[PDB]
Amino acid sequence: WPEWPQHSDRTRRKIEEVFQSNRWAISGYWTGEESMERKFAKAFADFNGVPYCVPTTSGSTALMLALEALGIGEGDEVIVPSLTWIATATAVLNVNALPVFVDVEADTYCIDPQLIKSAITDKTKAIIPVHLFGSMANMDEINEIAQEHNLFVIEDCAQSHGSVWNNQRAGTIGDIGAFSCQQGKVLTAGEGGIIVTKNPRLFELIQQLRADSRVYCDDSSELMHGDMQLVKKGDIQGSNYCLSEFQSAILLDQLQELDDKNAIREKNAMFLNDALSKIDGIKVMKRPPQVSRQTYYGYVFRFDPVKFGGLNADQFCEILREKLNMGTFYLHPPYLPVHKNPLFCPWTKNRYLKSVRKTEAYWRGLHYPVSERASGQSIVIHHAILLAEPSHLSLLVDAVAELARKFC
Amino acid sequence: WPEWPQHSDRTRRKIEEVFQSNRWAISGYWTGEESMERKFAKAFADFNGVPYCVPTTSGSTALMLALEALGIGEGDEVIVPSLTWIATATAVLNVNALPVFVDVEADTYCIDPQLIKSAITDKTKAIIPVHLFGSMANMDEINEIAQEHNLFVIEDCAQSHGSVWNNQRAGTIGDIGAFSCQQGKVLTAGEGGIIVTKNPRLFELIQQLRADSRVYCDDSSELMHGDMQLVKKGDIQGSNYCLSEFQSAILLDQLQELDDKNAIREKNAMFLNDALSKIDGIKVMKRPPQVSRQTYYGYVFRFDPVKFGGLNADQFCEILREKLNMGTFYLHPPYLPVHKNPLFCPWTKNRYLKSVRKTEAYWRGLHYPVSERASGQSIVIHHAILLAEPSHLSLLVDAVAELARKFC
Numbered sequence: 025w026p027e028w029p030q031h032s033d034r035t036r037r038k039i040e041e042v043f044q045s046n047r048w049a050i051s052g053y054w055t056g057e058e059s060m061e062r063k064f065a066k067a068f069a070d071f072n073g074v075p076y077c078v079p080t081t082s083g084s085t086a087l088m089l090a091l092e093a094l095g096i097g098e099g100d101e102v103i104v105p106s107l108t109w110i111a112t113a114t115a116v117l118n119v120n121a122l123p124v125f126v127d128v129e130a131d132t133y134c135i136d137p138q139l140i141k142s143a144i145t146d147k148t149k150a151i152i153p154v155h156l157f158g159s160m161a162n163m164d165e166i167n168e169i170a171q172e173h174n175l176f177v178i179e180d181c182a183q184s185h186g187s188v189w190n191n192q193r194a195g196t197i198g199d200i201g202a203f204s205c206q207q208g209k210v211l212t213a214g215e216g217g218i219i220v221t222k223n224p225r226l227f228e229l230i231q232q233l234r235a236d237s238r239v240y241c242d243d244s245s246e247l248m249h250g251d252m253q254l255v256k257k258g259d260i261q262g263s264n265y266c267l268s269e270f271q272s273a274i275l276l277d278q279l280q281e282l283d284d285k286n287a288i289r290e291k292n293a294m295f296l297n298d299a300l301s302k303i304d305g306i307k308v309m310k311r312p313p314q315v316s317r318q319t320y321y322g323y324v325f326r327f328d329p330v331k332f333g334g335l336n337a338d339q340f341c342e343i344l345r346e347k348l349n350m351g352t353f354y355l356h357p358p359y360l361p362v363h364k365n366p367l368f369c370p371w372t373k374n375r376y377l378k379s380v381r382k383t384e385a386y387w388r389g390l391h392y393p394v395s396e397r398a399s400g401q402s403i404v405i406h407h408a409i410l411l412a413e414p415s416h417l418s419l420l421v422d423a424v425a426e427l428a429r430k431f432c
Numbered sequence: 433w434p435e436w437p438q439h440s441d442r443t444r445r446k447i448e449e450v451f452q453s454n455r456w457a458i459s460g461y462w463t464g465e466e467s468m469e470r471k472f473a474k475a476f477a478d479f480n481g482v483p484y485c486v487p488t489t490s491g492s493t494a495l496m497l498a499l500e501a502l503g504i505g506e507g508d509e510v511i512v513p514s515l516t517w518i519a520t521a522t523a524v525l526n527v528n529a530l531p532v533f534v535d536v537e538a539d540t541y542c543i544d545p546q547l548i549k550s551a552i553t554d555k556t557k558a559i560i561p562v563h564l565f566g567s568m569a570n571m572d573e574i575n576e577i578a579q580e581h582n583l584f585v586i587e588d589c590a591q592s593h594g595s596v597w598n599n600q601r602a603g604t605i606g607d608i609g610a611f612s613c614q615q616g617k618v619l620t621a622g623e624g625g626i627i628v629t630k631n632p633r634l635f636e637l638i639q640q641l642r643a644d645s646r647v648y649c650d651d652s653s654e655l656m657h658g659d660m661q662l663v664k665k666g667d668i669q670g671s672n673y674c675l676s677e678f679q680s681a682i683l684l685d686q687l688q689e690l691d692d693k694n695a696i697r698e699k700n701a702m703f704l705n706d707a708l709s710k711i712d713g714i715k716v717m718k719r720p721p722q723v724s725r726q727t728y729y730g731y732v733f734r735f736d737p738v739k740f741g742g743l744n745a746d747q748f749c750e751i752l753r754e755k756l757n758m759g760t761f762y763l764h765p766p767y768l769p770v771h772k773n774p775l776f777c778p779w780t781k782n783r784y785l786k787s788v789r790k791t792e793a794y795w796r797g798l799h800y801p802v803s804e805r806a807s808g809q810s811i812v813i814h815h816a817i818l819l820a821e822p823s824h825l826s827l828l829v830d831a832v833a834e835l836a837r838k839f840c
């Protein structure tokens with residue numbers, strides 16, 4: 025089976041270019057030509073059809089800085105989906121705000137717009153929709169709600185680089201878009217993050233937030249070898265969340281084939297959708313008409329335990345991995361909801377305000393039915409598998425079909 | 433003149449090893465052999481003679497996590513020197529605590545122990561001494577004060593990798609040591625950070641704080657290809673501050689020659705100390721008897737404006753750079769004190785608690801005479817210059833000597 029990550033001599037070439045420039049950080053001085061960071065930023069901005077792009081250290085930090093740039097802090101509430109990686113919620117706690125969970129839709133696993141209004145209070149300042157696995161949150165409904173209630177929208181696109189909703193790439197629709205480039209993502213450098221926005225003011229603030237209150241110099245063409253490209257601004261307090269040049273170089277390389285590989289993943293995902301949907305008891309995810317291009321970080325399908333011998337997703341996956349010989353990293357059940365995830369334990373850290381970290385019972389006692397049911401009756405196939413030949417993917421289909429015949 | 437950073441085919445070899453392992457992140461699965469992160473951690477721990485080492489994303493984040501691990505948060509005060517990079521103070525604000533500045537010593541530019549007591553209040557929980565440029569803070573005095581007042585000590589070693597005080601490497605003396613591996617530092621991968629501690633409990637907490645509440649599995653030798661090396665713990669809430677494998681690889685390479693290069697820098701620094709000290713009006717930094725090995729991230733010497741035509745450090749440096757033909761990055765005046773640095777502007781961010789960010793007047797109105805005088809009558813030579821041949825360094829000495837004769 026295809027493995028992940030993937031590299032080529034082109035990747036090595038980009039790394040060699042960093043060594044030749046002898047500039048390993050954006051805070052390093054100008055050595056003659058543009059930094060890998062800015063070259064990648066320009067390329068990704070074009071890819072996303074978004075005015076501004078600022079690379080950073082991780083998707084988690086990308087989310088945090090997005091919140092900081094919007095002026096979110098103590099006393100504020102931010103609405104987030106219960107089903108997602110814990111970072112979507114911890115980024116909120118990191119800025120002293122309170123994450124407020126809302127359940128997801130049964131057929132997309134993305135935040136349910138019809139449950140958002142009920143969670144809005146006078147403290148609500150933003151919503152962080154997540155385009156989970158291989159689906160997009162309903163940005164039409166979400167932006168309508170955000171507009172009516174004067175709320176900001178931050179798109180968590182860590183699992184949807186390149187997805188398109190009504191001809192707008194994921195991340196360009198909300199006020200600020202955040203991406204992760206951690207190893208498992210479709211665009212990766214091992215570690216890495218990306219922030220994008222259409223607003224010029226936010227672009228300046230984001231730069232400062234990740235470069236110790238600094239911004240790019242007025243004109244890079246006027247720079248001489250030895251001159252600093254980052255200059256003081258001081259409009260907003262920032263810290264160091266600069267991506268290394270080695271990572272920006274790898275991202276530049278990986279980006280050149282992102283659209284093509286996403287196209288392959290989608291072709292195969294659709295193939296699976298039509299094949300798996302014919303099996304009684306299997307339900308594929310519902311694709312919104314507004315989505316013209318879907319990036320599949322993870323291919324998800326659901327099953328009815330009643331029609332599959334009462335198996336839970338863990339057992340279902342174990343059976344499939346044995347039959348297909350693929351690793352746990354590549355075929356497994358979805359995350360546990362954030363409020364139930366052992367990795368989510370805000371109350372254990374004094375750094376968090378007592379008013380927002382609450383107590384163990386406060387979070388664990390929350391109830392979000394749809395999100396909770398997900399890890400028990402859904403199967404997630406990592407995108408690398410979607411790069412395999414159709415003949416190979418057919419084996420997965422046959423496996424699910426066999427298992428089904430075993431209970432029919 | 434020698435430039436920085438510096439690499440070799442050994443550096444390229446380490447990078448190729450990461451590509452061969454196809455594991456680019458510590459959160460990636462086991463691919464057969466130990467991660468670059470753990471190999472570097474083990475090597476650096478041996479280098480520092482410290483029990484535990486956890487690599488992270490930056491020196492700024494290293495400081496922040498050190499504070500989080502010690503339980504520092506809202507309502508706490510942390511004593512820091514006025515003369516240092518702004519991160520020493522912003523890391524404190526990042527955990528919702530209040531940084532409290534103390535002036536530095538005239539002949540070392542490190543926090544003045546005799547001024548620390550006066551700053552201690554019932555809210556004080558820790559002290560963050562910084563081993564600035566080419567000097568070490570008096571750890572004897574600081575640990576005595578910390579012991580008497582029940583305070584934690586976090587050593588900011590971003591500018592002193594390898595320094596030795598009473599046969600203990602910088603960072604191993606306090607409760608937790610933090611290091612930066614940003615491009616300009618003596619040990620670098622473009623971006624990067626390191627945390628070290630002697631305490632087993634803190635080691636576990638630090639791991640979780642940088643890996644989303646996870647720790648290393650019980651035994652890596654029992655791991656099969658495909659298995660995750662990071663496992664859930666949940667004793668303390670963490671976020672993602674994992675160093676990429678590419679960076680850990682470069683650090684492993686750079687570490688192998690760190691001690692030798694530091695030895696060269698020190699030999700040359702001493703040469704300069706004996707030569708420059710003979711010039712009327714020039715004062716070298718005072719080296720504590722307890723320091724047996726001094727890492728010179730920056731070589732600093734002071735001058736008496738009264739004996740040097742009233743020149744300020746900026747003009748003095750401009751003259752020297754013209755005569756020696758070296759860049760501003762390599763020869764320049766010290767930082768402005770943190771409270772006066774335009775990059776330090778806590779009041780501009782809502783993320784910070786109103787109680788700790790205060791106002792512009794609160795910080796800018798502070799007064800720390802020694803730290804303030806530093807940027808006006810001190811010259812800093814970047815460590816790369818200290819790797820030059822003695823004959824070349826003599827040119828610097830001749831330049832200062834010429835300038836002196838011009839005012840005599």
Ligand SMILES: Cc1ncc(COP(=O)(O)O)c(CN)c1O
Binds near residue numbers: 083154181182183204
């Ligand atoms: C929705 C979401 N947000 C944020 C993150 C964090 O990304 P990172 O591990 O690069 O800090 C992830 C997982 N990578 C995620 O799935």
Ligand SMILES: Cc1ncc(COP(=O)(O)O)c(CN)c1O
Binds near residue numbers: 516520588623
């Ligand atoms: C004392 C000190 N602390 C922390 C830092 C921050 O280091 P970093 O740029 O790797 O986040 C620096 C400068 N690198 C520093 O001099």
